[PDB]
Amino acid sequence: RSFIAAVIAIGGMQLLATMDSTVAIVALPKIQNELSLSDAGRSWVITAYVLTFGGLMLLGGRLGDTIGRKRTFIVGVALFTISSVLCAVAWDEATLVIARLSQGVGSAIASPTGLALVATTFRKGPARNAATAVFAAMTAIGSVMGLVVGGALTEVSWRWAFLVNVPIGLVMIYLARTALRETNKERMKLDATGAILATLACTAAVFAFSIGPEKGWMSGITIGSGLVALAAAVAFVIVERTAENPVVPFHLFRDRNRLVTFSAILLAGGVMFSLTVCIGLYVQDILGYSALRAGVGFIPFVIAMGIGLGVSSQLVSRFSPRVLTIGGGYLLFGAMLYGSFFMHRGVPYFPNLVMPIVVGGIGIGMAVVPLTLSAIAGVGFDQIGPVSAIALMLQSLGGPLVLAVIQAVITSRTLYLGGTTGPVKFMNDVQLAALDHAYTYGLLWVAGAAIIVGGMALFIGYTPQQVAHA
Amino acid sequence: RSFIAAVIAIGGMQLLATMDSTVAIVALPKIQNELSLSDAGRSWVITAYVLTFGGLMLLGGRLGDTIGRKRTFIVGVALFTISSVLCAVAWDEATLVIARLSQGVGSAIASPTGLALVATTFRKGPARNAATAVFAAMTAIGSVMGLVVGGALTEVSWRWAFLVNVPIGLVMIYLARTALRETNKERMKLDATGAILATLACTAAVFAFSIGPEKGWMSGITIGSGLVALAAAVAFVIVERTAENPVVPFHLFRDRNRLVTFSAILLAGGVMFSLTVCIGLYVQDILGYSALRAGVGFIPFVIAMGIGLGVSSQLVSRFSPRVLTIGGGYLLFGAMLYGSFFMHRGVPYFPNLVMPIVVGGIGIGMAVVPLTLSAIAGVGFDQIGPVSAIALMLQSLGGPLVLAVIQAVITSRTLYLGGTTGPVKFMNDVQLAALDHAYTYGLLWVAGAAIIVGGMALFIGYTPQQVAHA
Numbered sequence: 001r002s003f004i005a006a007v008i009a010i011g012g013m014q015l016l017a018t019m020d021s022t023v024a025i026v027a028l029p030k031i032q033n034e035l036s037l038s039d040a041g042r043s044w045v046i047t048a049y050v051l052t053f054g055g056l057m058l059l060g061g062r063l064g065d066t067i068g069r070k071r072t073f074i075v076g077v078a079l080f081t082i083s084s085v086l087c088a089v090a091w092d093e094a095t096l097v098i099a100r101l102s103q104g105v106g107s108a109i110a111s112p113t114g115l116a117l118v119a120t121t122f123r124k125g126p127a128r129n130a131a132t133a134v135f136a137a138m139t140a141i142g143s144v145m146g147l148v149v150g151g152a153l154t155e156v157s158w159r160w161a162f163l164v165n166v167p168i169g170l171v172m173i174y175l176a177r178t179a180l181r182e183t184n185k186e187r188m189k190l191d192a193t194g195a196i197l198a199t200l201a202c203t204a205a206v207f208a209f210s211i212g213p214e215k216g217w218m219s220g221i222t223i224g225s226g227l228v229a230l231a232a233a234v235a236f237v238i239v240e241r242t243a244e245n246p247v248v249p250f251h252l253f254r255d256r257n258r259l260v261t262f263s264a265i266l267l268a269g270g271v272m273f274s275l276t277v278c279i280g281l282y283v284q285d286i287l288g289y290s291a292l293r294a295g296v297g298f299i300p301f302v303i304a305m306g307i308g309l310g311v312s313s314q315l316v317s318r319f320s321p322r323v324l325t326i327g328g329g330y331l332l333f334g335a336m337l338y339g340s341f342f343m344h345r346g347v348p349y350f351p352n353l354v355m356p357i358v359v360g361g362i363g364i365g366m367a368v369v370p371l372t373l374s375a376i377a378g379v380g381f382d383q384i385g386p387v388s389a390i391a392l393m394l395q396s397l398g399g400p401l402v403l404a405v406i407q408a409v410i411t412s413r414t415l416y417l418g419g420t421t422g423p424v425k426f427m428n429d430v431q432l433a434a435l436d437h438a439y440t441y442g443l444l445w446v447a448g449a450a451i452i453v454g455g456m457a458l459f460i461g462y463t464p465q466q467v468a469h470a
Numbered sequence: 471r472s473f474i475a476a477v478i479a480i481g482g483m484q485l486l487a488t489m490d491s492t493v494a495i496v497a498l499p500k501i502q503n504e505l506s507l508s509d510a511g512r513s514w515v516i517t518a519y520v521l522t523f524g525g526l527m528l529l530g531g532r533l534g535d536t537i538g539r540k541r542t543f544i545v546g547v548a549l550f551t552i553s554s555v556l557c558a559v560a561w562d563e564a565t566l567v568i569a570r571l572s573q574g575v576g577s578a579i580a581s582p583t584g585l586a587l588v589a590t591t592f593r594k595g596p597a598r599n600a601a602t603a604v605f606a607a608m609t610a611i612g613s614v615m616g617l618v619v620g621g622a623l624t625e626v627s628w629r630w631a632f633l634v635n636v637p638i639g640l641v642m643i644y645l646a647r648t649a650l651r652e653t654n655k656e657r658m659k660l661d662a663t664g665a666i667l668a669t670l671a672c673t674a675a676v677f678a679f680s681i682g683p684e685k686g687w688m689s690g691i692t693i694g695s696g697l698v699a700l701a702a703a704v705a706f707v708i709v710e711r712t713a714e715n716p717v718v719p720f721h722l723f724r725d726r727n728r729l730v731t732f733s734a735i736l737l738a739g740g741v742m743f744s745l746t747v748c749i750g751l752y753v754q755d756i757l758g759y760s761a762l763r764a765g766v767g768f769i770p771f772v773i774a775m776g777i778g779l780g781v782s783s784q785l786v787s788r789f790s791p792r793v794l795t796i797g798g799g800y801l802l803f804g805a806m807l808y809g810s811f812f813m814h815r816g817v818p819y820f821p822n823l824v825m826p827i828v829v830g831g832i833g834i835g836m837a838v839v840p841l842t843l844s845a846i847a848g849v850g851f852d853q854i855g856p857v858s859a860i861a862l863m864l865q866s867l868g869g870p871l872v873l874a875v876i877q878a879v880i881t882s883r884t885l886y887l888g889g890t891t892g893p894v895k896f897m898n899d900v901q902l903a904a905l906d907h908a909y910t911y912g913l914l915w916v917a918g919a920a921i922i923v924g925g926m927a928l929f930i931g932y933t934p935q936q937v938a939h940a
């Protein structure tokens with residue numbers, strides 16, 4: 001009863017953050033009709049969360065070492081819960097932007113500490129292997145359960161959708177309080193100069209990337225904010241050399257296989273993120289299931305992924321992470337190919353749409369566990385903080401980058417086959433068929449990116465003794 | 471009975487050609503002990519057969535039209551059969567070389583006509599699909615049965631090995647005589663100047679490549695012969711513009727998907743060729759099975775190959791060649807990955823060495839049939855001759871090229887891990903472990919080549935209406 005309570009508490013922020021993002025996206029169209037925030041404000045509610053979530057993410061990595069990882073986890077989750085309540089009672093656009101800024105700060109504080117708690121709370125061995133599976137298992141639960149909740153309690157009001165996090169947030173705080181123990185180690189002085197430059201460099205980069213399309217890539221404020229990011233980034237590296245308790249220990253990333261493992265997650269995260277966002281759009285637009293039905297139809301993915309994580313936790317003590325990652329990705333590669341050849345509009349559900357999802361889910365579940373274990377292997381307690389933060393940012397950073405390329409490919413072929421750029425509802429059913437074949441074509445590009453991840457995963461070379469089995 | 475006799479007769483030369491090459495390589499060591507032809511003579515017996523087999527191949531494409539395909543086939547097999555008897559009673563080195571040269575001339579005339587008879591004898595539809603399966607099926611039966619025969623009666627004398635072709639050749643001549651019909655059409659005059667230059671251009675290039683390693687790549691005769699090959703090639707193309715009944719119709723090869731198809735066969739043949747040669751060497755040297763046991767152990771591959779060919783023949787009329795080629799290659803890709811990870815020395819036979827061979831066999835069987843059908847699609851009768859000849863040359867030419875790269879990689883890593891270059895009988899059993907890991911490392915390189923074939927097979931774009939089902 002103490003072990004199940006501990007694992008659930010550590011992964012709580014993963015469930016909340018993933019679920020919040022899915023619920024926010026689903027409710028965007030209805031927020032217009034009530035607040036009337038125009039198209040410009042449509043994207044600000046989304047970028048507002050990401051502006052502070054990514055800008056302050058590396059600050060939260062080192063924050064646990066100077067304050068305490070348990071007291072940082074509770075504070076991060078508590079602030080996130082309070083922000084949801086405020087977000088649900090926003091009377092104008094202004095209140096909603098500040099409400100979303102607060103959520104990003106709360107997620108930035110807690111998300112890196114959640115992964116760092118896995119390494120320190122559980123000793124290396126079977127305990128850590130099971131904890132990692134539960135950590136990754138409920139990241140997918142939040143995504144699917146968001147679709148069900150967001151698509152169900154949205155025909156009454158969008159405000160109630162944001163209130164669903166309060167019952168969940170309260171439980172995780174209670175479990176974390178009554179299941180986690182505070183380590184008795186002396187606190188470490190925070191890196192002042194290195195931290196401010198890192199926060200200023202990351203936030204400026206995200207602002208310029210987000211505002212670029214709105215104002216144009218060469219507007220003047222886009223590259224104008226890009227200049228600050230480069231100046232901030234440059235200064236950050238120089239003062240890191242003579243930094244005590246470094247925010248980013250660059251010396252820790254040498255020509256060894258640490259770069260390979262951290263490069264795989266960056267591109268692997270991009271493949272995963274672009275795969276869910278495209279599949280979600282395809283189901284809603286081309287097949288027209290709607291939000292509630294799509295969420296219920298993806299329940300087998302969670303069950304299928306649960307099997308993959310459960311099996312991989314046992315095998316990770318006997319096979320190296322190299323073979324498991326390749327073995328898991330081999331099943332996923334077959335799933336994408338089948339969906340790229342026999343996935344036209346009008347097919348039934350159980351024969352055609354369920355099987356590739358189930359097989360794809362098992363393949364992903366098998367490969368997630370070995371990668372996470374090797375990312376936090378052979379670090380220690382005085383550098384697990386920053387290393388955990390770097391692992392998650394690369395996973396999050398790879399999402400938008402790969403997705404941008406895929407969406408560009410989708411649009412280009414839509415016009416080639418005969419198509420129109422705009423809302424799907426105004427389509428003559430011959431332009432729609434072009435959109436259907438554009439999405440199927442894009443699935444080949446995602447598969448191509450998966451091959452690169454597999455190829456670069458052959459260089460990892462970790463043995464099962466190091467990552468686990470101790 | 472009539473149909474069965476026709477398909478067997480047409481594919482006869484594939485069985486003989488593949489069996490003869492496998493038997494010759496096995497009996498090379500003893501030909502030294504009796505004839506005493508020295509190390510220099512070791513390669514002339516092999517290169518003699520390939521010098522004329524590749525030199526005269528393009529002349530045999532257009533021979534069928536000027537005299538007749540049935541008569542050309544019988545003449546080609548007959549001269550091959552007579553040469554084997556003369557090869558079996560060679561007095562010394564000299565008599566053996568002319569014995570091997572004659573076999574190459576006979577196989578050059580009959581092999582291109584064998585594939586042409588498939589297109590012109592069976593109308594497009596289920597008949598052709600079945601005929602294509604048998605044509606590719608007996609290529610593997612000859613390969614495996616060569617090892618058994620070459621390892622079974624090699625302990626008494628190498629002269630009995632070459633006489634095994636005589637009983638098989640005599641049956642195939644009888645079947646072709648009483649099962650194939652002579653076509654009643656007017657003959658087309660043979661291209662004198664174009665044919666002569668092509669034989670000179672191709673023969674000189676093969677000679678230069680073969681003798682280069684012996685005398686060095688910059689000896690003077692190596693590049694000296696290469697100049698003659700280049701001079702012949704340019705003269706061949708210039709005259710070929712104003713040629714009647716052209717030997718090589720370049721105009722037939724345009725930017726359409728014929729180049730993509732013919733490019734895949736060139737590289738696909740290399741992957742297939744390098745896979746059997748390397749696997750045979752690994753089995754004999756590392757596992758120490760011996761020739762007879764290796765031949766008997768590869769029987770499941772033939773049965774697995776037969777199942778893949780049979781299934782693909784039925785599916786080719788419902789699914790395009792693009793998906794079948796990818797589907798078959800996907801199974802093979804998994805088989806080679808498994809071998810690259812769990813194929814150390816001393817593993818048992820049934821669980822480890824059989825299953826990857828069986829799975830790989832089905833993958834290859836599925837992919838060859840769609841590729842063969844698409845290679846002879848949309849051609850006609852007045853140009854089937856040269857097109858079939860080009861298909862075989864590209865398949866055979868891709869073998870040595872890809873194999874040379876793979877062998878260099880295996881040799882380089884053997885020294886890296888600690889080993890020696892030389893006979894495998896004088897290794898320390900620590901130097902042999904390095905060789906074992908080198909072979910499995912090379913298998914990944916073959917997988918890299920296989921991926922490129924799949925990537926370039928996505929551009930085929932033939933519908934099932936064109937290649938079959940008509």
Ligand SMILES: CCCCCCCCCCCCCCCCCC(=O)OC[C@H](COP(=O)(O)OC[C@H](O)CO)OC(=O)CCCCCCCCCCCCCCC
Nearest residue numbers: 136139140143265276278279280282339356357360372443
């Ligand atoms: C990486 C390790 C790092 C460790 C560093 C530390 C961190 C460790 C944890 C990592 C967690 C990653 C796993 C989570 C996966 C995310 C996806 C998910 O949990 O949820 C499922 C999602 C449903 O979508 P959602 O509802 O989430 O969408 C939201 C929209 O925003 C709403 O609109 O996707 C899928 O089902 C995946 C199926 C894939 C199978 C292959 C496809 C076959 C083809 C079928 C036809 C499709 C058309 C063709 C193709 C176009």
Ligand SMILES: CCCCCCCCCCCCCCCCCC(=O)OC[C@H](COP(=O)(O)OC[C@H](O)CO)OC(=O)CCCCCCCCCCCCCCC
Nearest residue numbers: 606609610613735746750752805809826827830842909913
């Ligand atoms: C494309 C056509 C276009 C149309 C053009 C028209 C023409 C069409 C013809 C197409 C030809 C294809 C069929 C014939 C294939 C021939 C291969 C064969 O039927 O024969 C078995 C062979 C063994 O070779 P042999 O014994 O014959 O060689 C003897 C040496 O010569 C002695 O010196 O291959 C295999 O076993 C297959 C292996 C597949 C699975 C992958 C391996 C898994 C790992 C296992 C452990 C190995 C060690 C690790 C790896 C190192």
Ligand SMILES: CC(C)CCC[C@@H](C)[C@H]1CC[C@H]2[C@@H]3CC=C4C[C@@H](OC(=O)CCC(=O)O)CC[C@]4(C)[C@H]3CC[C@]12C
Nearest residue numbers: 270401402405444445446447448449450452925928929
């Ligand atoms: C006529 C149709 C059927 C052909 C369409 C398929 C090919 C043109 C696709 C198949 C695989 C694709 C490749 C698959 C993967 C990649 C990885 C991708 O690599 C990345 O750098 C990821 C993006 C990034 O993070 O920058 C670049 C494109 C490329 C080479 C793709 C190029 C286009 C290819 C060859």
Ligand SMILES: CC(C)CCC[C@@H](C)[C@H]1CC[C@H]2[C@@H]3CC=C4C[C@@H](OC(=O)CCC(=O)O)CC[C@]4(C)[C@H]3CC[C@]12C
Nearest residue numbers: 455458459461737871872875914915916917918919922
């Ligand atoms: C050191 C260990 C732990 C890693 C294994 C080495 C990998 C880094 C190798 C294995 C697969 C290799 C690739 C496999 C295949 C190719 C195709 C190869 O292209 C050809 O095969 C051309 C053949 C021809 O001449 O026609 C070029 C190298 C490349 C990219 C290889 C690059 C190096 C890779 C990734």
Ligand SMILES: CC(C)=C[C@H]1[C@H](C(=O)Nc2ccc(-c3ncccn3)c(Br)n2)C1(C)C
Nearest residue numbers: 268271325329330364367450451453454455
């Ligand atoms: C050269 C080579 C042998 C490539 C391997 C590719 C692969 O499948 N590579 C792979 C392996 C794992 C993951 C993954 N999937 C989800 C989450 C995290 N990682 C991914 Br995208 N791709 C294939 C099976 C073709």
Ligand SMILES: CC(C)=C[C@H]1[C@H](C(=O)Nc2ccc(-c3ncccn3)c(Br)n2)C1(C)C
Nearest residue numbers: 738795799800834837838920921923924925
């Ligand atoms: C980009 C992409 C989707 C690649 C496909 C590769 C493939 O598997 N490609 C392939 C397909 C067929 C054959 C074959 N095999 C034997 C005889 C004839 N053809 C071969 Br070598 N490779 C994989 C399954 C990774």
